[PDB]
Each structure stands twice: as C-alpha cells, then as structure tokens.
Amino acid sequence: RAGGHFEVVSPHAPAGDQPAAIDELERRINAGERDVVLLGATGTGKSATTAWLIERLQRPTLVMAPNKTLAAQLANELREMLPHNAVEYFVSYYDYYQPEAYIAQTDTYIEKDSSINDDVERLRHSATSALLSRRDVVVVASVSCIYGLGTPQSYLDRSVELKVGEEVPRDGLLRLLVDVQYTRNDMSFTRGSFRVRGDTVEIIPSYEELAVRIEFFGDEIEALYYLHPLTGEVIRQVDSLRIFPATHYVAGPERMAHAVSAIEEELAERLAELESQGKLLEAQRLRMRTNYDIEMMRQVGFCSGIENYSRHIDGRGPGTPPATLLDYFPEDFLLVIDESHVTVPQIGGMYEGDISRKRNLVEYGFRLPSACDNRPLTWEEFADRIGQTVYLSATPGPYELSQTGGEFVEQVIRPTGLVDPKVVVKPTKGQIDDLIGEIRTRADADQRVLVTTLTKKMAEDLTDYLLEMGIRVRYLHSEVDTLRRVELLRQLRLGDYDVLVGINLLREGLDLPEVSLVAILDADKEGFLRSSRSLIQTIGRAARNVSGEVHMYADKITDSMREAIDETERRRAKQIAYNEANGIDPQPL
Template sequence: MKDLFKLYADYKPAGDQPTAIASLIEGLESGLSKQTLLGVTGSGKTFTIAHVIQTMRRPALIMAPNKTLAAQLYGEFKAYFPDNAVEYFVSYYDYYQPEAYVPASDTFIEKDSSINEHIEQMRLSATKALIERKDAIIVATVSAIYGLGDPDSYLRMVLHLSRGEQSDQRKILRRLAEMQYTRSNLSLERGQFRVHGDIIDIFPADSERNAVRIELFDDEVENIAQFDPLTGEILQRFPRITIFPKTHYVTPRDRILQTVDWVKEELQERLAEFKEQNKLVEAQRLEQRTFFDLEMMLELGYCSGIENYSRYLSGREAGEPPPTLFDYLPKDALLIIDESHVTVPQIGGMYRGDRSRKETLVQYGFRLPSALDNRPLRFEEFEARSPQTIYISATPGPYEQEHSDNVAEQVVRPTGLVDPEVEIRPVRTQVDDLMSEIRQVIQQNGRILVTTLTKRMAEDLTDYLNEHGVKVRYLHSDIDTVERVEIIRDLRLGVFDVLVGINLLREGLDMPEVALVAILDADKEGFLRSDRSLIQTIGRAARNVKGRAILYADKITGSMQRALDETDRRREKQKAYNEAHGITPKGISKSITDIMEGAYQGKRNTAVAEPSPEYLHWSTQELVKHINTLEKQMYLHAKNMEFEAAAKIRDEYLLLKEQLMK
C-alpha cells in the first residue's frame, strides 16, 4: 500500500510547492471537504496535485473544463505515473446533434452523432480501472456528470472465466451476445468475437490493441491467453480473465423485460392524457415511436435512444438522479477540479439547457415524460456526490471562495519566472502598434497571442496581418477539439507565429514559446474583459522569460486595475523569493508532443519495402502546404462517397503529419 502511486519526476518540489502540498495534505487528513489551490500560471500546480495523490494513496477524479485541457492533463499525469492506471474520460462524440423539436416551424430534428471509437474505448477502460484497481487517476470533463449505465447492471453482465472451470461454449457465446459483442469470422476488431472450433477469440471493448483467446476442451476452459490480433502472437497467459461489456448501457435480459412492462404502463397513461386534451397527432406519434423502441429492445436488447428509458433500466424513481461516473468512484476517492472558476459554473449550467429541450419533446409527443430523467446531475446532486474536493485556479470564483475551508497559495514559481510586465497603450493606434510589436517578437523567435472582443474583428485582423506577410491563424469556436490542439502545436512548432482568438486563449494552455500577449479593447467592461479573464490571458505569457503583455485601452477600468494589482503583487512576491534564494529566472522547456494523438490515430497499412518518399527532404512550409491540400482532397473524396481514395490520401496525410512532428 505504501508505494501504491509511484511518482516519476526529474525535480523535487520547490518555491511555494512544498508549503502548498503540506497544506492540502493536512486539510485532507483533517477531513476538510473543500480546499482551493490558488496557483499562478507556470507554478507547477499539476506537480503539486501529483504529490498530494502520491502521499494520500487515494484514487482521484480530475475534472477539466474542456477536452483540450483534459488531454493536456492526461498526458502530464501519464508521465508522472507511468506505472498506474491513468485514464481519460470525455464525451466520445466527435459530432453530436441531440434530437429536438421546433414548434414554430413544426420541425423535428433527429438525433445525429459520430462516435470516436478510440475515446469510447478509453471511457470503458476508465470505468474498468475504477472497478478493478485502487491506483486509478481519471482525467475527465463535465461528461462525468452525464448519465452513464447503472454500475450494478454493468457488473452483473461481466463475464468471468477461469482455467480449469466447466463452461459450455454456447453459454459463453450467448453471454457475449448479451454483452453486445458481435460475431465476426473475418477480421477481429474491438467489441467483436470469432469462433474456430473450440477456440473463441474476443477483442475486449476496453482494450486498445490486445485480444483474448479462450481455448476449450470437452466443455472445460483449457487455456486463457492474451494475443496480438494483427500478428496472432501470444503475449501472455492468465489463470483467469474478466471480460467487460461492450457498452456502459448494457442491461440484463430480466431488466429489459421489466422495463418494457413499465414503459407500456406509462405509455397508456400518457396516451389517455393526450386523447383527453384532443391531441390526437401527438398521441399517435408517441404510440408509434414508443412501440418501435420496445420492439427493438425485445429483439436486440437495445434501441436507438435507449438512454431515454434509463430511469426504468436503472430501476430509479421519478426525479432521482441518473447513475454517472461518480457512482463508479470508490468511497475514498479525491475530486480535483482544474480551472475551477470555469468548470464549476459549467457544471451548474448543464441541467437547465438539457431540460428545456426535452420538455418540448415530451409536450409534443416525441418522448414519454420519463425521458426527462435522462439528464446530467443538478448542481446540488453533484455537490452531494462529490468526495473531498480540491479546486485549482489562478483566479478562484465566488463559489470556491465562499465554500473552501482552506486556501493553499502557490504564487512563487520554482523556475524563478516572474509574471509578465504589463503595458497599457492607446486604442487609437492599436493595430499599427501591434504590427510593430509582432515583427520585433518574431525576430527574437517568439510567438504572439492576440485576443479580440468580436469574431468579426478577429477575422479582419487575421486578414490584415496575412496581407502584411505575417504567418497567422485564427482560433474560433467552430474548430473542433482535435484541430484546436493541432493549431496550438503548430504555433509552438513555428509553422505560424501569431494566433488570434476571442475567448479561447485563456485557461491552462501550456505554450512556453509565447513571448507576447496582446489584449485589444481591454477597457470594454464585460465577461471577456473581467479581472479574472484579464489575469488568465496575461498568464499565457508567464512561461516565457521574456514574456510581456500589452493592454490596449484609453482608460483603466476597475477590472483592469484589479488585474494589474494582482499581477504586480505576484511579481513582487516572486522577485523577493528569487533574491532571497539567488535564483536567475529561466524559461520553461517543454517537449512538443501531440497530446490528442490517441484520440484520432488511424490504422495504416504500409507496403513492404516502401520506397523512401520525396517529402523526407521537404521544408516545413512545403510539408504544411501539402498537408492542407491533402486534407481538402480527402474530405472531397469522402463527400463523394469515394472512400477507398479518401483512405489512401488519409494514410499519406498521417505520414506527412508524422514527418512534421520529427
């Protein structure tokens, strides 16, 4: 138990870290339910939390406000704890359009989604780690408060096999089908099984690359082995194995039958209500849709939109909270909420938006009233389920300030880096002045972040900089998670020098190459120019020894003054620490890796003795240009349903991106 978590790092706690670690551990040991780690950018908050987890020897759930930050944290914790179960739990949708009805135009929008199979596998691996291991660290987003399959039903469906036990082959195959595994006698992919005589090969849904082989003889399990499904090589043998269901929403047959009966009862009550109100169209619509779903559930064990019947499937009463990832957490788990000033309000806002959409569906006969219980947790339910919690932020919000029993401050950076110098310049000449600053920073091999107030201004500024020969990209809300990570990585690599955005450049983005942050129209009071937003944005330059921030403003607002005062306070504290310990500030050196690599890795077949391609000798600019061309061609082929051509281009596209990373 002593070495349950083994932390690997080339450095030891320094600066404010030892005090913060001791303070948080003391708070946890004395039973404090909520604490805050107030840590500035670049002070090593993740390292501090890693030490707390190692010392407390307790599993942890770490929540981040978005997939990008979650991926960054996942990579960092994976590096700190390579021997432990560090897992990633985020929404598995690459694209998600929930079902909705617009009464004004009588338009029904069917649910449409695209599931990222790799992230689905990582979610299943996360819950498996929580069930099987005491050393689990789960990095999640707000997806953790959304409905998940009931853990009791999920565990009832698990398949246990031991070497030497009596087990009928047909019984095993039937059980795999109930767990929603599909049979395939050709290639073996995740969530499938195949049968050759007395040998059953299973590719567990939670496994990234290895499959399981069960060898039977005379209805006895003779051998259990793990093998590589590509080469067939046996990797290791086991005395016993546990196979988990293909999905969190798998349900035992008896519960399905009971659910069908309960749904029929509710349907009759609802139809009577509609007919009494003379809503015959709604009644017919509801009856038709519900009976179709019930028929699918009886035949297949599931249906499209089965989550809308989750109240019955998990055996809950009306209004009871749904089972979520929190129901899989051990009782002694820790909850760490990163960038809490964003994440906490986000958790509070999820329930209301979901509710209004579903109420319309229920009112117009698209769903039964019980569908309202397929929902995220309310904030008070989240609070009730939360174990001991540590909030992390450079700018804690009102909730954390009010509810925290202890605040551990981490203002001093071990690297000696001080907060960036902040200058205020007039708005009237902001674009010309910015252009001049950009040219100076580029000459010193630095990168620049520019934040504007509106989408229109961001687009115009990007066009203007482009016309003047600046390599610039615009980061906006329409860009998906994976592409956003690629853009940030390309900025660090120097593929371009300036990144323009609105509200996407604040929390947690780790970019030591950024030497200048420019905030346009800083004196326009509002959410994007609040003291918290300004402190967070200024902090993006705090990882660079030459880091500076320029605020373009004609007057100093209250928010600006508070941000400037707090930045000055932190600068003075860091300078005093540096003088007392004889520290010379040094920039952070961080390797540039693709933190979301696992989320979109494709299987690629390479020809034997493939000739050395010409692009090995191309410059970075030529590579980037060709990659963009290939991407357009790939999507064009896919749009025209020419999937083989698209796949061929995709393989070349991935090879080029790999080359770019070298």
C-alpha cells in the same frame, strides 16, 4: 476494488511552493474539507500536484475538465508518472452528434444523428471496468459523466471471470458473452466480438485493446492466452481473467424486465399527458417509436434511445440523479475539478439547455420523462453525489469560493523561477504608431507579439491596415478553424511573422513562449468576456517570456484590470525574491 499503490516515478525535484502546497492540501482533505480551492498560477504544474495527492490518498480519483481538448494533453502525461496503475479516460464518444431535437415552431424533428468515435468508448469501458475491478483508478471526465447511465452494480454483476483448469460449459460461456454484449462474429475479428472454432474461442474485449484465445477441453477451460487480435501473437498467458459487458447499459434479464415494466407504465403516463396536451401527432410518434424500441428489447435488448429509459433500467425514481460514473466510483473516491469556475457553470447551463431540449422532446412526444431523467445531475444532485471537492484554478469561481469559505491553497511560485511581465497602461490613442514601432523593435530580434480586440469589424479592419503597412500580422474571428492557427504555429516557430489580432477565442488554446509583449485593446468596457479572469489570463499569457510585457490601451482603467496587474506585480516581486534567494535567475524550462 483492489487498489495498487500509486507508484510515482517523478525525476523532477519538487521545490518552491510545491511541498508546502501539497502538505496544506493534504491536511485540508484530512480535515473533512468537502470544499477546497487552489490558486495555481501559470506554470505551477497542477498535474503533478494532483498526481501526488492521488498517491497520498490512494483513492479512485475522478478529475473533471470542461472540454475534451484539455483531457488529452494531461492523461498521457500522468501515465508517465504512473506506469503501474489504472489511468483511464472518458468523454463524449462522438466524432459528431446532433441530438434528438425538435423545432416546435416548424414541427421539425432533427433526429439524433451521430458519427461515433471508437477509442473514446473503448477508454470509457476500460475506465468503468477498472473502477469496478480495482481502487487504483483515475478517470478524466467531461460533464457527460453526470448524464444518465447504467448501474455499476449490474456492470459488476454481468461481468464474468474464467480461470484455467476450471470446468465451464463452453456454450454457457457463449451465452454469457451474448448477455454481456459480445457478438459471435464467426466471419472476422473485431472489437468486443469473438469467434468459435472447435473448442477454440478467440475474443477481442470491448474495453481491452488486445484479444484472447481460450482452448477448451470439452466443457472445461483448457487454457487462456493473451493475443494480438488479428495476428494472434500470444502476448503471454495467465490462468484467470474477467470480462465486463461491452455496454454501459448493463442489465440482467430481470433488470430488462423491470425496465420494460416501468417503461410501459411511464409510456401510459406520457400517453395520457400528450393526449391531454392535444399533441396527438407527437404522442403517436413517440408511441410507435417506443413500441419498436420495446419490441427489440423483448427480442434483442439493444437499440438506440436506451438511455432515455435509464430511470426504468437503473430503476431509481423520476427526478432523482440517474446513475453515473460517480456511482461507478466509491463513496471514498477522490474528486478533483479543474477550471470548475466554468465546469460548474457548464453543469448548470448544460442541465438547463438539455432540460429545455427534454422539453420539445418529452413534453412534445419523443420520449418519456425517463428521458428527462437520463440527464446531467442537477447541480445540487451532483454536489450531493460527489465526495470531498477540490477546485483547481488561479481564478477560483464565485460559488466555489462561497462553498469553500473563501480560503484556498496557494501555488504560484514555479520552481523554475519565472516571473510575471511588466505591465503598462496607455489611452486608446497612439495605438497604431506604437504598435508598428514595437512590431519593428521585436522584429529586430524576430520575437512574437499578441493583440486583443473587441469588435469583429474593427479587428479585421485593423489587421488589414497593419498588413497595408507591410506588417507580418494575422487576425482571428469567431469561427476560425484549426488549420489557420496551426500553420501560424509552424510560421512562428519558423520565424515568419510576429503579431496576431484576436478578440475572444484567442484566449484559449495558445501557448507562446516567444512573446515578450502583448496588447489589450479597449479594456475600459466592463464586459463578461473581459472580466478579471480575462485580464489574469492575459497576464499569464504574457508571463511566458523571461521579460514579457503587458500593454493595455484604453481611455479609462477598469478596477479588475489594475487590481489584477497590482497583485501580479507584487507576486512577481515575491517570485524574484525567491529566485535571488536561491541564487538562481528565472530559469526557462
């Protein structure tokens, strides 16, 4: 893994808590701290700190996020600060994905269906190649990373490199191209495919966006050239270059042999298991499906459901962690988990749901227990296969704090100088009148406002009344779709409305600098979705404006809500003191 120095191009000048925070995290990792926590308040810029930490450590970094949504906005941004290193990406490559599912009650086979995305898989393979070709590699991963995979060993083995001048049989080159999952598309030119015309060979690699033309002097590598795939415009020329398999189910012919052997053995196992279970229909269905699958291994080596045989392909034992992007990473790989407070619970919940599915799949004759092995690593298995662990959240998780001992690294004072909002608490009564009054007060300057709710019925009834009072108000429900709130963003930046009325999903995917006031309905109830994390999230939301404000209307006051408000106000005083010590007012940025 040739690790090029993480060249950081950061015109921003670190200030505030950034230097101390980075230094203390650095010494934390130096101290062998396999468990660390960070308290990154809103607007504290965790991305830049993570980039600088990765620069300092010079290790291949895996960053963990809980939904594909988040990964997009960050990775592109880091590439700006790191335009001379391998920045990569990986999430579910599925525009749509119904799993292999089995309604046992109805004996219904909801077969695995998937609309496959392209660029996601492209970046997946680019990331795997970069990791197994260089140490200066950063990869953003959804939980999918811990699912079953092929071995980075074979990934690096099947890969083959060719250099200019060196004698190499062209036919052998085509053979290895086939063995590394590349098609002789003599008709057209497509991703991960190639064409042969005379001694000339032109290939688009699966991971590399561009293409390459190679001229052959008989059975010698005459020359290599970059290319635009279709137009063929030679980007440049380099003497040598490597090619990685287009599949992450990489496996030598010997590895296919071993996988087939173990597949047949565990097939006999599952055969006997379902025969004893009396699930003869499921046993026979699985038997014939895997018979076709093994037939087209012995013929082609490629099909659907290959993952279900990862324990056979990787060759490790049942119940052990299947291969992973973590294996694609070194042992001295850098690790970062953002929003681990939901990523770790997501890991366990995903394992539980997916093993419940592997029940009614394997337990009910669809695949072998090797399918169950082709799983997210059990939380413990992940915790072992990881390296040093750094959690990033202004709200550290309970188990996270247990792992880290409760200590953490603070970064809450933004260098800009923004301060937290002024909070107010009132009983549920006097809500409509005050809401309309503040609506008009903000409409004087045409400013934004937010509202939370608990029950769908009351939420939409209240929004309907507000509309009846001639209020520029909208609301949100459980399964609202992107168009509604995106046109809401258009409206608000065009100054059409002021207020919105959501319940739960509003908590995510909204950044509104123009809201100086938020309302929180019926926080009195002690609820999971309205926990201290919820109130802190609303606090961060209201902190956007220069003089934002929080207003929670509930008969009683929950412990979490008011402790969060108090800590918010004291750190707000701290931020104000820092601002005025700089002689700088809170600076919008």
